[PDB]
Structure formats: structure tokens, C-alpha cells
Design a protein around this ligand. Structure first.
Ligand SMILES: Nc1ncnc2c1ncn2[C@@H]1O[C@H](COP(=O)(O)OP(=O)(O)O)[C@@H](O)[C@H]1O
Ligand SMILES: Nc1ncnc2c1ncn2[C@@H]1O[C@H](COP(=O)(O)OP(=O)(O)O)[C@@H](O)[C@H]1O
Ligand SMILES: [Mg+2]
Ligand SMILES: [Mg+2]
Lengths: 139, 7, 372, 732
């Protein structure tokens, strides 16, 4: 990251600073990394965080300067397509099945998260065109 | 038999 | 399925039947008759020889020879008839198709065993054969594992001790007094009352007298004096022509010769003293178990009184503290065949038979090694 | 190998044959780490491995991906306790466990649902086998037989009762008559034993017959393998057959009094057991059921009193006593009152019986002889006569009963339904159990040869070489028991041998077999006893009983004496229709078993197995040691093991490909060749893919790993853009 990038990222980070000390929590680190355009797995986020324990995740504090190497470490379509094609072969996915797998497999989400992400992407049958959903979620 | 008796 | 024959060649009878039967199916005298007279009529029947009860039907016209004398087969070509008659006429059964068991005296010359075996395979092609000591089979019939067997048939008298199923082959006695030689003495003294019985067919008339009327003296000098004193013993017999003949002290006097072979001119002592002298050869520990288990066997022991005479006289030899016991079922004439029927049925016995293939490989010596 | 942390394994427990463990750490090649709380556990000079839970409880126990005794015990435990589904399949064999509560399940709606529908299609219930039998009988004329085997009280009779109700409802008065027969048969042929009351001692066979259109004509009954020996002898706290107790407890009723009976503890055949009364059965009432069944089924009342007269005869016989008068000569005392009663009841002269009981006759073609006989032979003969009378009475009652069931129109074909005691163990074992486990050997031989045939045929339905199949050959033990110089043959020989005793018999056994056969063995702490390696188990038999139980011989004179009776028509009628008089119990049992097996071998079988979940009776609740014992006695566990070798999995290409494509015939074989390196683990059929044990579980493993990787990719992408939208909210 160059100085301009570091400035935009620092400004964004400070928007996530809820205490005024120029720092975020470890548990916010993943949210900030994803908010800045990265798409890390939860495992990758914890690894760059050092697989923190609950206690340090909730109370150990890091400033932007310490967060930055972690974001860098995190930073370093056809796979995305095949991953969605697992659950397809007419280009659709049941809404009930997608809801179940998204809330019970992988990096399980909440029903509210799934309702939020699925809004506008399902048709009248409750099927999602996954190439379009993927383009949307990659933007 | 063959000796001591007739059979 | 398939059931062994059991055949017992006495001197005076053949007993035959199937194993597992309760009693023999055919019995007839082991006698062969030939005609001795000029043929008068064409269209008369022709037969070269009559066997058993046929020869006893026509004995008046025949000469009667026994092939067996003192348990030895004295000529073979007659005996091979007696067996031919037995299997084909009496039992009506193929000898090629059944195991067969044959029964013999304990000491007789061992060629007799060799030829008796030889004929079964070589003439009859019997599948399987065995030979067994009569005094053994008398125990199987009596239902015992330990005893001394006294056996007297038509032609041979013998003793064998057997203790808990072991025989004592050093301990074994044989006498050549038998029912035949009682009959030959019975003729010779019957002559003294002036009845004369000369010829071979006529001898069986005497044999019927011996079977029907003899009995054994309990005390010989007292019964002799009682017969001298009165008619009270005296009893009389019809003859096939209708003559009646009347017999006194004599009718007991023949059974006495079994106990005093001096009468016939034998050296050896009576069946009592030979029985005791057999017991003496056994180890002293055995002897109490023999003294109870005296088994009578064979037809010559059928005379009334013989059990009581045996007990009373062997008692006087034995040490007084023993108990003497004498075991005489009225079966006993059969018992050697009954015992052989019991033996032939056992599954353990099936593992020993002289088999045709083994005979062919070994030759007729095989009997002496395998059989006993 | 596969093991991980939070894999699971079974380990033994002293009060539960297997218990669950979670694997806590995973290892490559001597101690395992388990949680239960927590224990370490040794490897020894590997544990059971456990099905992924979606599979567990599936209707057919060979659907399971891992097959073993813990899995099959678990599946039966959950299916019975949780779901109340008693009926369960292994292979073709149905397995049934008495629920011991009534259920909806038998209703007519279920009958109609099962009818016409295939074996896989429906869940198991006995109607599913019965309908399979019926449809096979239609598919070609060959007779179908149905075989139900299990320990005493397990539910065989009731299982057959419903199996008949199926035919009477679908095809179909036959049902009423057959169901009304049972209180007669159970009365004459069932007995009470220390393992339980109301144990059937005989094998019972029902044929149901049909016309050319498979409407239902009528029924025939046969019986086999009667335990004659129970009549004269009883082990501690056993009983002789029920009807004797029913009669004795009835003895006060104004019908019976002429029979002059005593109390039930007075008769030597009742007295030996030391157990007059069964808990909670008032047998005096209980016979009134049997008499109702007789009257409905058409035994005239004039015959019925004759039956009780004969059984009273037998009991009065057993109480006859012999003096002994010299070592070789039994005698009957100057007057003996119960013999007088016996003669009053059956009308034969007192003195003719006193003579012929005491003495034996021996007759050649030319002369007749009469022998005294010892008190031992007197007793052996008396008891053999009692057994012969009982067995003829029984077979005459059976011959009457099947009259009413027969129909005049001739059947086109029949379905044969069989109720027979299963393989057995008792904590003393005796000639009765030796017979029962021999018959069970013969049955399971047929069972194996049929299952082998079925799988041979199922293979060449498709291209796969037969050669892979093998089966359990139990023929050497049958040859041990049955064939000449075998345990039964040496027992009948020592019966003949002039002094015979269980010491001298044991000595014969040892000399013949002790190291000549792998399946016969001696317990090293007793001469009296010998071990046989049956297909299930090694059982120790005591010779102490055998000879006295083994021996029958009926003196023909006593038969003649009974045959001469004019007092009532039944007694001569029984005897109508020798060498059989000589035959021992062991030989009569062998011959009867051969007749049974020639009846069965003619027909195509189908099988049920019925297993008793607890020793002492609680509704609907399950022990596990007993259930394992029972499943070993059925041989099911051996069938499982041998199925676990070979190819216990099938899948259709259609069900397989759609799920496995996550990764046409050659494309699916290319998928498999990618997913599994080794061809030996699978085989191809025309319609199905075969796999060895648990390879489908490994395929599930790699599938789930794919599905987690893909879902993690999706969830990562979602989190990334959604958190960008969270930051755009934070700006906004
Ligand atoms: N009731 C009888 N009393 C005395 N002797 C008899 C009687 N019946 C047959 N005998 C004789 O017994 C002999 C037959 O005995 P047996 O044991 O049959 O001889 P084998 O068995 O060697 O032929 C013959 O001399 C016969 O006459
Ligand atoms: N399938 C079943 N459903 C309900 N109850 C049963 C079932 N099987 C058996 N029982 C109960 O258990 C008892 C014992 O079984 P039963 O079949 O009579 O003895 P056995 O197994 O010796 O033939 C039955 O009388 C009945 O009370
Ligand atoms: Mg003789
Ligand atoms: Mg029952």
C-alpha cells in the first residue's frame, strides 16, 4: 500500500474506531479487512490475527499501524463459479437449500444475514442466478 | 484231528 | 439297509439268521444223507444228496454222515453243501450281498480257519467275514463283561475265563467228550437191557431218547441204589414203528459220564474238575469274580439237574467262604448265536471285518493276523 | 486407515456388550485416547468403526456402511426403543423382537398397503415376507415355505398367527379353525422349563393350500421332532407336558372321577420335576380352553374322555412299583393297587399284565421261551411303553385335527409355515438339548446353502464372477453328530453293549474323537462331559442323563395285551400300523428330522428369526447381553461377518452419479477412478456399482470435504462484500 492507499484505509479504520484511541478490536479486524475489499476466510483472518483467544479478541487493542501488516497478509472467478455450481444444472439453487447450507455449513451465517444477502437475488420459485449473485458480491 | 483223535 | 448274516457251525446243528434278529431264522441238523439202495422206479426223484431236514425226512433210506467231528471240518465238499443249503434254501438270500460271521471252537487246527475263510471269498464272494470264539459270544448273550464260560455242544466241550473283557489264553481247557459221545455210550449200555441200535439213521433215534429222557444224578450212588430198589425212576419210550422200550437206572447213567469220563475211557476229569482247574490258572484276585459268574453254554448243558450238580460239586472244591453261583438261562442252547447277533450289530465291530480286497492282497493267512 | 479426533469407536463394557467412545487423538503405527468421561485405551498384539449417523437406523441392517455386532445391536436397539419398529431386515432374513405390548401395526389398512408391493419398497413387517412368498408362488408353481425360529417364548407362534391372518385376509373357515387348533397342540405338546414356562417341545408345520387361481382351499397340519423322553423324565424344576397337569388339577371334576386320579404331586411322571404349579396359570381352568377347541374342531366328546382315560392310564402306569426277588428276577408284589387301577382303566387282565410286565418272551421259529428280567430292564420297558403310548396318542390327535382342516377339492399348491425351536443353551445340557441343537444344525445348513444360492444367482444376474462368493460350511459337525462312529451312534451301540454306563460311554467318545476331530473337545476338569463346537457356540453336554433317556424297547407281548382290549374303541385304534419297536429315541429322532428336511428341501424357503429381548418380562424394554446371545444363536452375526467380507454395498448408477459428480457409465467410472485409486475396492454390475465395506463412508468423507471447501469459499465471498456494505453504511 502507498501513502494514498494508507490514508484512505486509515480514514476507513478510524470510522471503525469506536473508542477514539485510534484502534479497533481484533474482533473488528476481520470486518475492516473485508470492508477494504479483501475476501479472507475466517481462518485466514484469525491466522493473521494470530488465532487469538476469546479474551484477547475481546480486549487486546491494536492501532492502525499494527493492523496494517495483517491486512497485507490477508491480501496475499472460475473457482468462484464452480463453488456456486456445486449447489446448482439449470443455473438455479433452491432458496430453502441455500438457506440451510449457508446457515449450517461452511462459515455459517445468521438467518438475518442470509435474508439480507438473498434480498433481490431470488426469483418467484425462490431460485438465484448464481453468476449474477457472484458478480454482485464481487463488485 | 490228525493225531490224538479221529477227526 | 444291509445286515450281516450270523452263522454258527455246530457239530450237530446249524443255526443261522440275520444280525439284529431276536432268534435264529433257520435251524437244522448239520447232516448230509446219501442213498444206499437200488433204484426201483423210473420217475422216482433223483437227488444226489439230501441236506439237513430233508435227510431227516428220509433217513430210513439214507446213510447219514456229519462233516464236522469234534468241531473240525472233516471233509469240505459236504460242508460247502450245508452252507449252500443254508444261504439259498433256508435264508433265501444272496451271500454276495451281506457281511457274514462264522463261529468256531477255541483251539482246533488252524487250517480249519484257513479253509473256512477261503471258501467264503473264493466260492461265495462274501463281501466281509469274521470268525469268533463261541465262549466269547456266550458272554455277550448272557449280558456280562466278566465270567467263566463252560460250553458243551454236540462235538466239543471247552472252558474260557474272561475277566472284564480280557481273555486268559493260557487258562483255556478243551474236552472231546460231547453229546455225540454220550450218544455212543448210550447205545452201548442200552444194549445191556437188550435193545440194539446199530446204524447211522438209527443213532438219531437214540439221540431223541437222550434228549427226552436223560437227567443228571444229584448223588450218584444213592440214585443208583434207588433205581435198583424200585421202578420209581423207570420210564418208557415209543419207537417210530410203534414198539415201546423201557429204561431204568440207565437214563441217568449217561449224563454221569460228563462228570466221570473214566466210563468212556478218557483220562481227564469231569467238567467240574476241569472248570476248577481252569479257575486255578487265573490270578487269585480274579477268582472271586469267576466263582460267581459261571455261565452254562451249549445244548449238551440242557439236561435237567446239571446246574444243581455243578453247584453242589464245584462247591466241594472251592474254598468254603466263596459264593458259588451258576447261571443257566433256558435260552442257553441259542445263546452262542444270540451273542453273535449282538456282536455283529455293533458299530465298533464294523471297523474290523476281513474285506474282500484285503483278503486278495494278504492271502488266506490274513485271518491269523487280524481275526483271532 | 481412517481415524480422526471426533471419530467414534465402540469398546466393551462388563454390563453392556459395547459402549460408545469418541476418539480424541488420531494415530499412525500403541494406545488410543478416548472420551466416553475420558479414558485411554490400548491397542493389542483396532476398535470397531462406526457409521455416519444419517445411515443409522435404516430399515435394512446391511444398508449400514460399517457392518459389525455393535452396529447391528445399536440399530436394533434404537429401532425398537425409539421408533417402535420391531420388524427389521438383514439380507433376506427378517429379524423380529417381541414388543410385548399390543400395537396398531397389524391393522387391515397395513395389510392392504403391503399387498402387491416389493420387498425394498416397504418397511419391514411380516406381511412383507408373506406377500413375497405369495408373489413368488404365483411367479412359478414352486411351493414356498416360511420358517420361523427362535428361543422359547420369543413370539414364534404369534408371528405365525399373524402370518396366516395375512393369507386369510388377502385370499380368503380356515383361519378360525387353524387359530382354534392351537389350545389343543399347546396342551399336548408344550411344556414348562426353567428357562421359561410354555415352551413347545415339538416342531409344528402348517400347510396352507390354494386353487389354480390362488384362492384358498384349506389347510394341512404335520408335526415332527416330538420329545418323547420328557414323558418319563424331568430335570429339576422342569415339567412334563401341560395336559398332564391340566388333568390332575381337573381330577375332582365329576367327569374324571372314574380315572381315580390323585393330586398332581402323586404321580411319578409328575412328581420328579418338583414343580407342580406354574405361576399364575390355573391349569384346571386352562383345559376348558382346550376342550372348547376340541369341540369346535370336531373331536367328539366320546373320544375326548378316551383321551383322558389313556393319559390317566400312563400316569397310573408310572406309579407301578417292582419288588426284586433274586438278583436276576424282578417281581410285581402279591397285589399292587395302582396296577389294578391301570387294568381297570384299560380292561386288560391284571394277571396277564403282571406276567408280561415282569417277564420277557423269546421265540424261535421252532420253540418259544420265557425269561425273567431284572428290575432295571422292567423299568426300562415300562418307561418305553409309556413313551410309545404317549407318542401314538399324540399322533392320533394330530391325525384327527388335520381332518377338519383338509378340504375335498385338491390344492394346486401350498404355502408352508413352520414353528420350531431355535438354537439353545442351558446351564446344564442333556440329550434333549443335544437333539435340539442337532436339528438347528441341519436347519442352518439349509439356510446357508439357500443364501449362498441366492447370492450366486444375484451375481450372475450381472456380469461379475461368482468366484468371489464363499459360504460357511458346517457339514463336518453334522458328520460328527449324525454319521457312523458318531455321538448318537456310539450311544445306541452302548445301549446294546452288555454293560453300558456314562463313564464307559464317555471313554468311547474320547477314544474315538478326542483328538481326531477339531469340533469335539473335552472339558479338562471332568470325565463326565464333552464339548461340541456348534456353529454359534461351544456347549458342554453331561453324559449323566443320556443312556436312560436314550433307551426304548417295547416288548411285543405288552403291545399285544393292550391291542386285545375291548373296553373302548380308541385304545386298539391308536396302535394300528416291528423293527420300530427296537429303535432308540436317538434313531427315531434322526429319522423324523430326515422326514422334516426332505419336506423342506423340496420347497423354496423364506426366513424369519425371532429373538427375546429380556430374560424376565417387562413390556417393550431391552437387554443387550441376551440380544447378542440370541443373534449369535440365530447365526445372524456370522452372516453379517461373511457379508462384511465381499461386497456388502450396492448403489444404482442413477442415485450415485448425481451426488458424486461434485467430485454416461464410463464418465461415472472415470469419476470413481479419480476418487478411488484402487479398482479392487469396487466392482461394476450392469445396473449397480458394488463396493467393499465402508468405502462408501470414505466417499462420503471426501464429498463432505468438498462441500465444506466450496461453502467456505462462498461464505468468504459473502462476508467480504457484506462487510464492504457495512463500511458504506458506516460512512452513510
Ligand atoms: N433238551 C435237550 N437236552 C439234552 N440234550 C440236548 C437237548 N436238545 C439237544 N440236545 C443235544 O445237544 C447237542 C447239540 O448241542 P449244540 O450246542 O447245538 O451243538 P452245536 O452248537 O455244536 O451244534 C446234540 O447232541 C443234541 O442232541
Ligand atoms: N408380535 C407380538 N406382538 C405382541 N405381543 C406378542 C408378540 N409376540 C409375542 N407376544 C406376547 O408374548 C407371548 C409369548 O410368545 P408366544 O409366541 O406365545 O410364545 P412362543 O414364542 O414360545 O411361541 C405371547 O403370548 C404374547 O403375550
Ligand atoms: Mg454249540
Ligand atoms: Mg411357543
Amino acid at each position: 500500500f502507498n501513502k494514498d492507499q494508507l490514508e484512505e484505509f486509515k480514514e476507513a479504520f478510524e470510522l471503525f474506531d469506536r473508542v477514539g484511541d485510534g484502534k479497533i478490536l481484533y474482533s473488528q479486524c476481520g470486518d475492516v479487512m473485508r470492508a477494504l475489499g479483501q475476501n479472507p476466510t475466517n481462518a485466514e483472518v484469525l491466522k493473521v490475527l494470530g488465532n487469538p483467544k476469546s479474551d484477547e479478541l475481546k480486549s487486546r487493542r491494536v492501532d492502525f499501524e499494527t493492523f496494517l501488516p495483517m491486512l497485507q497478509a490477508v491480501a496475499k472467478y472460475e473457482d468462484y463459479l464452480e463453488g456456486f455450481r456445486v449447489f446448482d444444472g439449470n443455473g438455479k439453487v433452491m432458496g430453502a437449500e441455500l438457506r440451510h447450507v449457508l446457515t449450517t455449513l461452511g462459515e455459517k451465517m445468521t438467518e438475518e444475514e442470509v435474508e439480507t444477502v438473498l434480498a433481490g437475488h431470488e426469483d418467484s420459485n425462490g431460485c438465484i442466478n448464481y453468476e449474477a449473485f457472484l458478480k454482485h458480491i464481487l463488485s | 484231528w490228525x493225531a490224538x483223535c479221529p477227526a | 439297509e444291509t445286515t450281516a448274516l450270523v452263522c454258527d457251525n455246530g457239530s450237530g446243528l446249524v443255526k443261522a439268521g440275520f444280525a439284529g434278529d431276536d432268534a435264529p431264522r433257520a435251524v437244522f441238523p448239520s447232516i448230509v444223507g446219501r442213498p444206499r439202495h437200488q433204484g426201483v422206479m423210473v420217475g422216482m426223484g433223483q437227488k444226489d444228496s439230501y441236506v439237513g431236514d430233508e435227510a431227516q425226512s428220509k433217513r430210513g433210506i439214507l446213510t447219514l454222515k456229519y462233516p464236522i467231528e469234534h468241531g473240525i471240518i472233516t471233509n469240505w465238499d459236504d460242508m460247502e453243501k450245508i452252507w449252500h443249503h443254508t444261504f439259498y434254501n433256508e435264508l433265501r438270500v444272496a451271500p454276495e450281498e451281506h457281511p457274514t460271521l462264522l463261529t468256531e471252537a477255541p483251539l482246533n487246527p488252524k487250517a480249519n480257519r484257513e479253509k473256512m475263510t477261503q471258501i467264503m471269498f473264493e466260492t461265495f464272494n462274501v463281501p466281509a467275514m469274521y470268525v469268533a470264539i463261541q465262549a466269547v459270544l456266550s458272554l455277550y448273550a448272557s449280558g456280562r463283561t466278566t465270567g467263566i464260560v463252560l460250553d458243551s455242544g454236540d462235538g466239543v466241550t471247552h472252558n474260557v475265563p474272561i475277566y472284564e473283557g480280557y481273555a486268559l489264553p493260557h487258562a483255556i481247557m478243551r474236552l472231546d467228550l460231547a453229546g455225540r459221545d454220550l450218544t455212543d455210550y448210550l447205545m452201548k449200555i442200552l444194549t445191556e437191557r437188550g435193545y440194539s441200535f446199530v446204524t447211522t439213521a438209527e443213532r438219531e433215534i437214540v439221540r431223541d431218547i437222550k434228549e427226552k429222557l436223560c437227567y443228571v444224578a444229584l448223588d450218584f450212588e444213592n440214585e443208583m441204589a434207588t433205581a435198583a430198589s424200585s421202578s420209581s425212576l423207570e420210564k418208557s419210550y415209543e419207537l417210530p414203528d410203534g414198539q415201546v422200550i423201557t429204561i431204568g437206572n440207565e437214563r441217568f447213567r449217561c449224563p454221569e459220564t460228563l462228570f466221570q469220563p473214566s466210563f468212556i475211557g478218557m483220562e481227564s476229569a469231569g467238567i467240574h474238575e476241569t472248570t476248577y482247574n481252569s479257575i486255578m490258572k487265573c490270578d487269585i484276585d480274579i477268582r472271586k469274580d469267576l466263582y460267581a459268574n459261571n455261565v452254562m453254554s451249549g445244548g449238551t448243558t440242557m439236561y435237567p439237574g446239571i446246574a444243581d450238580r455243578m453247584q453242589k460239586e464245584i462247591t466241594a472244591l472251592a474254598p468254603s467262604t466263596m459264593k458259588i453261583k451258576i447261571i443257566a438261562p433256558p435260552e442257553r442252547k441259542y445263546s452262542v448265536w444270540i451273542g453273535g447277533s449282538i456282536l455283529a450289530s455293533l458299530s465298533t465291530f464294523q471297523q474290523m471285518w476281513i474285506t474282500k480286497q484285503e483278503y486278495d492282497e494278504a492271502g488266506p493267512s490274513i485271518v491269523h493276523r487280524k481275526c483271532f | 486407515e481412517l481415524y480422526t479426533k471426533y471419530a467414534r469407536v465402540w469398546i466393551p463394557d462388563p454390563e453392556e456388550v459395547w459402549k460408545s467412545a469418541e476418539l480424541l487423538k488420531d494415530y499412525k503405527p500403541k494406545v488410543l485416547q478416548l472420551r466416553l468421561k475420558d479414558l485411554e485405551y490400548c491397542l493389542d498384539p483396532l476398535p470397531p468403526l462406526r457409521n455416519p449417523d444419517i445411515l443409522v437406523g435404516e430399515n435394512d441392517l446391511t444398508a449400514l456402511s460399517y457392518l459389525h455386532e455393535p452396529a447391528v445391536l445399536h440399530n436394533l436397539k434404537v429401532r425398537f426403543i425409539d421408533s417402535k419398529l420391531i420388524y427389521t431386515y438383514c439380507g433376506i432374513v427378517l429379524v423380529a423382537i417381541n414388543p410385548y405390548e399390543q400395537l396398531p401395526i397389524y391393522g387391515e389398512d397395513i395389510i392392504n398397503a403391503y399387498s402387491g408391493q416389493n420387498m425394498g419398497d416397504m418397511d419391514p413387517h411380516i406381511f412383507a415376507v408373506a406377500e413375497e412368498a405369495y408373489k413368488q408362488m404365483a411367479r412359478d408353481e414352486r411351493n414356498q415355505s416360511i420358517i420361523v425360529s427362535g428361543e422359547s417364548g420369543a413370539g414364534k407362534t404369534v408371528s405365525a398367527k399373524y402370518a396366516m391372518r395375512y393369507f386369510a385376509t388377502v385370499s380368503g373357515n380356515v383361519e378360525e379353525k387353524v387359530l382354534a387348533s392351537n389350545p389343543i397342540m399347546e396342551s399336548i405338546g408344550n411344556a414348562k422349563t426353567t428357562r421359561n414356562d410354555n415352551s413347545s417341545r415339538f416342531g409344528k408345520y402348517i400347510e396352507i393350500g390354494f386353487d389354480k387361481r390362488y384362492r384358498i382351499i384349506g389347510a394341512n397340519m404335520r408335526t415332527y421332532l416330538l420329545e418323547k423322553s420328557r414323558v418319563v423324565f424331568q430335570a429339576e424344576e422342569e415339567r412334563n407336558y401341560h395336559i398332564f397337569y391340566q388333568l390332575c388339577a381337573s381330577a375332582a371334576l365329576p367327569e374324571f372321577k372314574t380315572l381315580r386320579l390323585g393330586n398332581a404331586n402323586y404321580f411319578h411322571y409328575t412328581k420328579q420335576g418338583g414343580s407342580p404349579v406354574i405361576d399364575g396359570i390355573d391349569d384346571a381352568k386352562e383345559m376348558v380352553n382346550t376342550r372348547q377347541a376340541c369341540t369346535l374342531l370336531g373331536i367328539s366328546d366320546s373320544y375326548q374322555m378316551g383321551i383322558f382315560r389313556i393319559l390317566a392310564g400312563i400316569l397310573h402306569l408310572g406309579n407301578v412299583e417292582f419288588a426284586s426277588r433274586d438278583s436276576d428276577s424282578c417281581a410285581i408284589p402279591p397285589k399292587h393297587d395302582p396296577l389294578t387301577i391301570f387294568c381297570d382303566l384299560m380292561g386288560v387282565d391284571y394277571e396277564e399284565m403282571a406276567h408280561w410286565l415282569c417277564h420277557r418272551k423269546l421265540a424261535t421259529a421252532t420253540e418259544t421261551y420265557i425269561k425273567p428280567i431284572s428290575k432295571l430292564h422292567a423299568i426300562n420297558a415300562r418307561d418305553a411303553l409309556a413313551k410309545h403310548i404317549y407318542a401314538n396318542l399324540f399322533n392320533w390327535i394330530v391325525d384327527h385335527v388335520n381332518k377338519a382342516l383338509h378340504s375335498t377339492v385338491k390344492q394346486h399348491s401350498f404355502i408352508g409355515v413352520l414353528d420350531i425351536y431355535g438354537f439353545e443353551t442351558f446351564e446344564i445340557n442333556s440329550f434333549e438339548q443335544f437333539c435340539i441343537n442337532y436339528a438347528n444344525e441341519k436347519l442352518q445348513q439349509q439356510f446357508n446353502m439357500h443364501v449362498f444360492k441366492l447370492e450366486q444367482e444375484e451375481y450372475m444376474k450381472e456380469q461379475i464372477p461368482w468366484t468371489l462368493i464363499d459360504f460357511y460350511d458346517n457339514q463336518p459337525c453334522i458328520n460328527l453328530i449324525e454319521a457312523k462312529m458318531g455321538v448318537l451312534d456310539l450311544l445306541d451301540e452302548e445301549c446294546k453293549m452288555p454293560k453300558g454306563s456314562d463313564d464307559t460311554w464317555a471313554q468311547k467318545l474320547y477314544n474315538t474323537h478326542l483328538n481326531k476331530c477339531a469340533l469335539f473337545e473335552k472339558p479338562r476338569l471332568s470325565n463326565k462331559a464333552f464339548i461340541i463346537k456348534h456353529f454359534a457356540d461351544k456347549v458342554e453336554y453331561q453324559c449323566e442323563g443320556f443312556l436312560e433317556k436314550n433307551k426304548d424297547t417295547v416288548y411285543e407281548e405288552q403291545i399285544k395285551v393292550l391291542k386285545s382290549s375291548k373296553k373302548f374303541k380308541l385304545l386298539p385304534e391308536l396302535f394300528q400300523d416291528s423293527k420300530e419297536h427296537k429303535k432308540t429315541v436317538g434313531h427315531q429322532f434322526r429319522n423324523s428330522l430326515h422326514l422334516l428336511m426332505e419336506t423342506l428341501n423340496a420347497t423354496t424357503p423364506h426366513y424369519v428369526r425371532c429373538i427375546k429381548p429380556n430374560d424376565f418380562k417387562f413390556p417393550f424394554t431391552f437387554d443387550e447381553k441376551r440380544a447378542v446371545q440370541q443373534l449369535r444363536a440365530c447365526g445372524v452375526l456370522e452372516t453379517i461377518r461373511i457379508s462384511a467380507a465381499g461386497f456388502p454395498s450396492r448403489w444404482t448408477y442413477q442415485e450415485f452419479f448425481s451426488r458424486y459428480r461434485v467430485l454416461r457409465k464410463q464418465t461415472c467410472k472415470n469419476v470413481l477412478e479419480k476418487l478411488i485409486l484402487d479398482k479392487d475396492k469396487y466392482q461394476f454390475g450392469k445396473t449397480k456399482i458394488f463396493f467393499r465395506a465402508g468405502q462408501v463412508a470414505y466417499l462420503e468423507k471426501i464429498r463432505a470435504d468438498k462441500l465444506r471447501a466450496a461453502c467456505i469459499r462462498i461464505q468468504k465471498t459473502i462476508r467480504g462484500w457484506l462487510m464492504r456494505k457495512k463500511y458504506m453504511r458506516m460512512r452513510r
